[model samples]
Target chain A: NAMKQEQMRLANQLCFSAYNVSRLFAQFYEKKLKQFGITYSQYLVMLTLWEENPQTLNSIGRHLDLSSNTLTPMLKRLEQSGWVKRLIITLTDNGQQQQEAVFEAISSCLPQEFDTTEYDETKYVFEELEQTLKHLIE
Target chain B: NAMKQEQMRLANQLCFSAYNVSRLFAQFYEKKLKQFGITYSQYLVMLTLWEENPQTLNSIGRHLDLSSNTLTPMLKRLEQSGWVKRERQQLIITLTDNGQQQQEAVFEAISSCLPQEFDTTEYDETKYVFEELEQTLKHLI
Candidate 1:
């Protein structure tokens, strides 16, 4: 009984529960996002860019906590899909010259709903989870 | 300002935030579970078995919301690691003696040094979070 109690403890199970929910969310989005020919992570990147048309590659990765190695390849695929375009910019600072990549969202490539649509029901369902996350991180 | 508000909306950001935190926790557990030679997902499987040994593959998957496609290979790996045995005729899983014994040590290692984020200080908050997640999952399915 004691072992079972420990096994079922909320503290012990929360992380796994969060992990499972997250995975399920990904699976949930996967089917819907498939219509746009993008994976869920790719959808996130597209959403990020749609919100901000021109952003430095580093800035985008900062939002996602993703590494350049992972982002570069995905960005390439996005470029191939014609939803985004990449540009190389040169900067000179303190006698040093460096190049950075920036991505711009192609406005015409995405539908308006993706940008301005309100998903009231979906919002209501996850509202508690969002509040809970804020509370936990508090 | 309008763009920022839209971006920060709960509907727009909830799934990604959950995904981010989930991956972060996996990374968090991975380091500690590495000592036991199991990944975070594998650790979950062990926990399930420790709670109840001799479960069918389908039953275990049902408990974890996992499918056989994902669980079968993982269970095979665990069997290869000498932590579990699969009965082919009945498709049930039972812990090996070695597997059963390693539980206490892994439990000790985890309890002593689990991440601070998962501590039990706010039991009420954690319970609410879990209830919310359970409901959200039910809604999704």
Candidate 2:
């Protein structure tokens, strides 16, 4: 009983930390993206597009781990801002919102100073933590 | 320069996991709060209030890491739901909302499933991971 209780305590602690970390990370992002009139979510979409342009909404959302519901409105706002253009693919018969030309607005301000090819320092810590999380949870 | 290249690779790995995890967590919470006609942010407000029944909106925002811009509508929704009430306190005129009765509404349906004590089976693994994360970030800084 004591062991089980201890285990549970540990789980709650990690979840809380993970939750707080998520919040802190989000707060940090507000500074990075404030100039673009873009929320962190919006910026994320742009980053993905910058890497690989002209993907369908479904593909973009999948890459970002967002659903269509979340992506649809975000794309709309992006289009409204004249930051990105969404068009239907005519080469194929299937009609879907294809995102294109979004990078021009924020590309100049992008942290190109930071090396894109470099492994993310934050991600390294996150990966180790993810492994530890699974191990502890298991 | 292998070390330099290694650092770069790790630096560019991306932060999708944290973003995705939080999004999923919020979605999970949204489903739970939907029946109450509350947005997930409103639900977070309620949780803060549950901890301290009479805190000002600014203080509550501090706890939640939100700004007034985000907190205003969130508090309004909770107020409308009658889950909480807001008024002036300490000349701050901030939110002091409480949903005393609604505790029963969520008790068994969701609250029961939550750990009664700070330490419960569902939370142990999470704690372990978080501690490691904290430690790693500490070293990085």
Candidate 3:
């Protein structure tokens, strides 16, 4: 019972940290992207396109925007509204035009202290955490 | 635009990494918990109640189980959905009959996604990661 309780609390706090911080990051991006009128998820699609230029749905999926269940719907919005063209996922003229403003918007508002060192360290820890879960589930 | 683009390079990576990893675990929990019609946050509250209260907890799930700032809509959904009841006109939260009885099934459902090779002992890696994540959280927050 003692060990179970301890492990339970461990899972509780561990994921809870990731959970709320992820949420906080959403609300964080929510404020940043509101002016540009795209969601953070959409912003990711935009980022993928911005970096990759002309991409297929699977190519965008290959990056951080992993699921078609989530990705396709948002990418649909971008296409209908003119960000990218389709599963081909090419940026429309408007899409290329807006990239600078959106990036600049997030860039300027981002915390001055949020450097690469901090980013790498945090990513390392979180990915390590993710690995442990995969190890368990595998 | 070039400088702006360059400036955002680190900003973009910083933004994606944490939110990305959170989703995998969250999506995992989402898969398991949505079976019970609960979101990850909602299940944390259930876990707390199943543990039946603890200093072992730290989240909006437990507090807003008592008070509401953000957990209001979700907690209320839990109540309306019949998993819990609220007091204070809304402070105390206790699970409904099915909520308690279903807990075992929820645990089973959660474990259903895992393989037989699982070990609770391996959670030691997870614990260390949590410690590191908690420490790293300070700089970001």
Top candidate on DockQ is 3
Better of 2 and 3 by TM-score: 3
| lDDT (10s digit) by residue, model 2, range B1-141 | 233333322322333466555555455545556677876566566666665657877877766667778877777666676666667652132234337656547533443333444444224444434444444433322
Q: DockQ ranking from best to worst? A: 3, 1, 2
* Cα lDDT tens digits for candidate 3, B6-102: 5566556545655666667677777778767888778867766776632222244433233355666876898888987766532666678977888
**Per-model C-alpha lDDT, please?**
0.61, 0.51, 0.63
For A1-138, candidate 3 gives per-residue lDDT tens digits of 344444545566557666555555555567777776778768777876777789877887878738656677787677776777754668888888777778656665354555666546545665666676766544
TM-score of chain A of each: 0.47, 0.48, 0.57
Residue pairs with clashing backbones, model 1: none
Q: What is the TM-score of each candidate against the true structure?
A: 0.57, 0.49, 0.49
Q: Per-residue CA lDDT of candidate 2, range A1-138, in tens?
A: 455445433433444455555665444445445645677677667656545557787877788898877787876666666567653201111111222222222222223333443224335445655554344323
B36, model 2: CA deviation in Å?
1.2
What residue runs in model 1 are displaced by over 4 Å at the alpha carbon? A1-8, A34-138, B1-8, B115-121
Interface RMSD of 3: 5.9
Q: Highest TM-score among the candidates is held by which one?
A: 1
Chain B TM for prediction 3: 0.67
Worst 10 residues of 1 chain A by lDDT: A95-104
